[PDB]
Amino acid sequence: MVVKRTMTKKFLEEAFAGESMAHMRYLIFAEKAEQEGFPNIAKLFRAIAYAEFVHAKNHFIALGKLGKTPENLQMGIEGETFEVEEMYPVYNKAAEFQGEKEAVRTTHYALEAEKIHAELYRKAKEKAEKGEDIEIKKVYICPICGYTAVDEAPEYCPVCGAPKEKFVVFE
Amino acid sequence: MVVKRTMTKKFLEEAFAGESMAHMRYLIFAEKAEQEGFPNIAKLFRAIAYAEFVHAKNHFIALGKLGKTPENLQMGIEGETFEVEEMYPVYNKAAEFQGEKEAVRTTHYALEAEKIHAELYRKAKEKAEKGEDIEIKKVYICPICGYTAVDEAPEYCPVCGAPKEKFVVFE
Amino acid sequence: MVVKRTMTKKFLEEAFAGESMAHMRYLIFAEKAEQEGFPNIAKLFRAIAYAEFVHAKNHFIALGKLGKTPENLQMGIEGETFEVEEMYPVYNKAAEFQGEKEAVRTTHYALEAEKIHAELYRKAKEKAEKGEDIEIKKVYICPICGYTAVDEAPEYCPVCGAPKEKFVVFE
Amino acid sequence: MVVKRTMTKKFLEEAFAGESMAHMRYLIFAEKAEQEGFPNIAKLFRAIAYAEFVHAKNHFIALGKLGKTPENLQMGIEGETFEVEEMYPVYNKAAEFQGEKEAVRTTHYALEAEKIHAELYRKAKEKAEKGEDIEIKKVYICPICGYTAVDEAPEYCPVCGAPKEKFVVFE
Numbered sequence: 001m002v003v004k005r006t007m008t009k010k011f012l013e014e015a016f017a018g019e020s021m022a023h024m025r026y027l028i029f030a031e032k033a034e035q036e037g038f039p040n041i042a043k044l045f046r047a048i049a050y051a052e053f054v055h056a057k058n059h060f061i062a063l064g065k066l067g068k069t070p071e072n073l074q075m076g077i078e079g080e081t082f083e084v085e086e087m088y089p090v091y092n093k094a095a096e097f098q099g100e101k102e103a104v105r106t107t108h109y110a111l112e113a114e115k116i117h118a119e120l121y122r123k124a125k126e127k128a129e130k131g132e133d134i135e136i137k138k139v140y141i142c143p144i145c146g147y148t149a150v151d152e153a154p155e156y157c158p159v160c161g162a163p164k165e166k167f168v169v170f171e
Numbered sequence: 172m173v174v175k176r177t178m179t180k181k182f183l184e185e186a187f188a189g190e191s192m193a194h195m196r197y198l199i200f201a202e203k204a205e206q207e208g209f210p211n212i213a214k215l216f217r218a219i220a221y222a223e224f225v226h227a228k229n230h231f232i233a234l235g236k237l238g239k240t241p242e243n244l245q246m247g248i249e250g251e252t253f254e255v256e257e258m259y260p261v262y263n264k265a266a267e268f269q270g271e272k273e274a275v276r277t278t279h280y281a282l283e284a285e286k287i288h289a290e291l292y293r294k295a296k297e298k299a300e301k302g303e304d305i306e307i308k309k310v311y312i313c314p315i316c317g318y319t320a321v322d323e324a325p326e327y328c329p330v331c332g333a334p335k336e337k338f339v340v341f342e
Numbered sequence: 343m344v345v346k347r348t349m350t351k352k353f354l355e356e357a358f359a360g361e362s363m364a365h366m367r368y369l370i371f372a373e374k375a376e377q378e379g380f381p382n383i384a385k386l387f388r389a390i391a392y393a394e395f396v397h398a399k400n401h402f403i404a405l406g407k408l409g410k411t412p413e414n415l416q417m418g419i420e421g422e423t424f425e426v427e428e429m430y431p432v433y434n435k436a437a438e439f440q441g442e443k444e445a446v447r448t449t450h451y452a453l454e455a456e457k458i459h460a461e462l463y464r465k466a467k468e469k470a471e472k473g474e475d476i477e478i479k480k481v482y483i484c485p486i487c488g489y490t491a492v493d494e495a496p497e498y499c500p501v502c503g504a505p506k507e508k509f510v511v512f513e
Numbered sequence: 514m515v516v517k518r519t520m521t522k523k524f525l526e527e528a529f530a531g532e533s534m535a536h537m538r539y540l541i542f543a544e545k546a547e548q549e550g551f552p553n554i555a556k557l558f559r560a561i562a563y564a565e566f567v568h569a570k571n572h573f574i575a576l577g578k579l580g581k582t583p584e585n586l587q588m589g590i591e592g593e594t595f596e597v598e599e600m601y602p603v604y605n606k607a608a609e610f611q612g613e614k615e616a617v618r619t620t621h622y623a624l625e626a627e628k629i630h631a632e633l634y635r636k637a638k639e640k641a642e643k644g645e646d647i648e649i650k651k652v653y654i655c656p657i658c659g660y661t662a663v664d665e666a667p668e669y670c671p672v673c674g675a676p677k678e679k680f681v682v683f684e
């Protein structure tokens with residue numbers, strides 16, 4: 001049965017947040033580990049990150065927020081809408097007011113590339129409540145300021161201007 | 172340059188936490204999606220999860236929390252120490268007090284498998300500050316209890332009791 | 343006095359082997375009897391097994407093979423080393439070539455669970471030659487594959503996956 | 514199913530004999546270990562003896578020799594008859610011919626105490642082919658010659674002459 005008590009629900013939510021942060025940290029660590037002269041430490045980081053993923057997935061299953069995909073896409077849609085509409089403009093304005101180049105640059109890379117996720121998820125949801133799988137192939141992603149390019153791939157990234165060969169393909 | 176003003180630091184930390192949460196949720200949704208009649212939805216889910224990972228990595232680099240591998244391993248060591256000493260025992264006792272099965276089960280799985288991660292990180296670190304890479308191969312992770320097996324893999328899982336065929340190989 | 347003539351020594355060794363086999367058979371028969379509606383036949387079997395043990399001990403001592411604890415531990419070390427290094431691998435290979443699943447299973451359990459006994463005996467000998475006893479409590483033995491667990495007990499059996507409750511405890 | 518191939522059967526029989534002998538050897542060693550300033554090595558000895566008992570039981574069942582209670586009692590009857598009628602008289606005669614006092618003493622103690630088991634087993638088998646149990650209680654065993662005394666125990670040992678309080682009781 002789903003967890004109903006408030007205090008333990010808060011405890012499990014905080015544990016899930018910590019596990020997600022740890023998994024992100026390990027995934028980031030592995031990239032620099034393989035950039036140096038240690039190709040095995042990256043393997044260790046990847047394995048431990050997968051262990052953290054398993055922990056966080058168990059915590060997510062316990063709280064009971066995961067179900068059928070047609071209703072599951074709505075949470076992603078709402079999260080993307082919140083990230084693009086409200087949270088990011090305020091952070092960009094605050095970073096402009098305080099005057100940090102790095103924060104402004106990162107927020108600018110963020111809000112301009114997060115716009116397509118909501119549209120893609122809405123299309124996927126309205127095409128996937130009848131029992132059929134959507135027709136999509138070769139989703140491309142920029143490795144610096146990831147811009148979800150669908151099917152075809154632009155020669156240069158409109159946001160950062162990276163060359164096409166750097167795109168990480170998914171198939 | 173690292174962010175020094177307090178408000179921008181808080182905002183970027185919150186953004187990093189949100190992006191990590193988004194990545195983990197998208198990964199879980201992808202794993203559920205591939206388990207049913209829609210194969211191509213998981214591709215989109217994993218692509219957008221990679222995009223969230225890129226955003227989180229940019230936010231993490233913005234706060235300048237990344238250094239060389241010797242110092243990188245210290246953060247993991249401290250995180251594992253805190254996860255296995257302070258948080259999980261208290262959460263398990265609270266879940267026992269309130270009397271719910273799922274939280275106790277998940278915390279029981281979690282607290283019995285995080286003791287080896289600190290030892291692995293310490294072993295990697297002592298070999299990393301000298302200039303060489305450790306030797307490791309065939310790392311197994313249980314997909315129903317997160318249990319790190321080094322090199323040899325037991326026939327049955329000493330935590331959940333799953334056969335050695337169910338494990339996942341990270342080579 | 344100890345027996346020195348050859349044929350007397352051969353006869354005593356054969357008698358020792360016969361008494362040991364009879365004691366094992368009576369123990370197995372008693373264990374089977376307890377699993378039925380005859381609880382007193384098990385008592386008779388246990389008493390007669392103890393009598394066979396007394397006869398076997400007399401035969402063994404008459405050969406002059408009982409010494410202080412160091413030499414007994416050394417003899418156990420040699421026996422365990424021979425059991426794990428030479429006999430069981432060849433027996434398992436021959437059984438697998440012939441094609442009987444029960445023989446392969448039994449020999450697999452025997453050569454997987456007999457590896458610690460030698461290390462325990464050598465540690466005990468190292469701690470029991472100066473003049474002191476070895477600190478150890480609450481040993482665990484599996485009832486379906488003979489798995490030794492010292493002090494702590496794993497949640498599950500790494501060899502057969504038998505639950506924790508089924509472990510027999512010696513203290 | 515039963516093992517039918519010849520060489521696998523031979524290897525299983527040899528392993529059964531070896532495990533039984535090792536179990537008896539460690540049972541013998543435990544009593545001397547606890548009779549010294551090392552009262553905890555007996556715990557290890559008994560735990561390893563139980564593990565070898567499990568291994569020997571596995572080998573015994575692999576051969577398919579365990580059956581219902583009447584068949585087990587018949588096997589015990591045959592074994593005891595062979596042990597008393599043919600083996601021990603010849604062993605005693607050979608020991609007397611060669612001239613060893615210890616072997617003669619041991620065989621003398623054995624052949625004058627093993628004569629009471631066959632009738633006990635015959636009575637138990639006669640009373641066990643009727644769903645009912647035999648009616649015995651408080652079996653006494655001598656510690657230095659294995660004298661099986663049923664119910665009432667003599668004040669002294671008719672074979673060696675040890676007092677009654679040295680007997681071990683099973684009830």
Ligand SMILES: [Fe+3]
Pocket residue numbers: 019022052055254285
């Ligand atoms: Fe963790």
Ligand SMILES: [Fe+3]
Pocket residue numbers: 080083114117219223
């Ligand atoms: Fe997004």
Ligand SMILES: [Fe+3]
Pocket residue numbers: 142143144145146147157158159160161162
């Ligand atoms: Fe770009």
Ligand SMILES: [Fe+3]
Pocket residue numbers: 080083114193223
């Ligand atoms: Fe996002």
Ligand SMILES: [Fe+3]
Pocket residue numbers: 022052251254285288
């Ligand atoms: Fe961890």
Ligand SMILES: [Fe+3]
Pocket residue numbers: 313314315316317318328329330331332333
């Ligand atoms: Fe497991």
Ligand SMILES: [Fe+3]
Pocket residue numbers: 364390391394593630
């Ligand atoms: Fe007997």
Ligand SMILES: [Fe+3]
Pocket residue numbers: 364394593596627
């Ligand atoms: Fe006998």
Ligand SMILES: [Fe+3]
Pocket residue numbers: 422425456459535565
């Ligand atoms: Fe052994």
Ligand SMILES: [Fe+3]
Pocket residue numbers: 484485486487488489499501502503504
């Ligand atoms: Fe087992």
Ligand SMILES: [Fe+3]
Pocket residue numbers: 425456532535565568
């Ligand atoms: Fe053995």
Ligand SMILES: [Fe+3]
Pocket residue numbers: 655656657658659660670672673674675
């Ligand atoms: Fe006696």
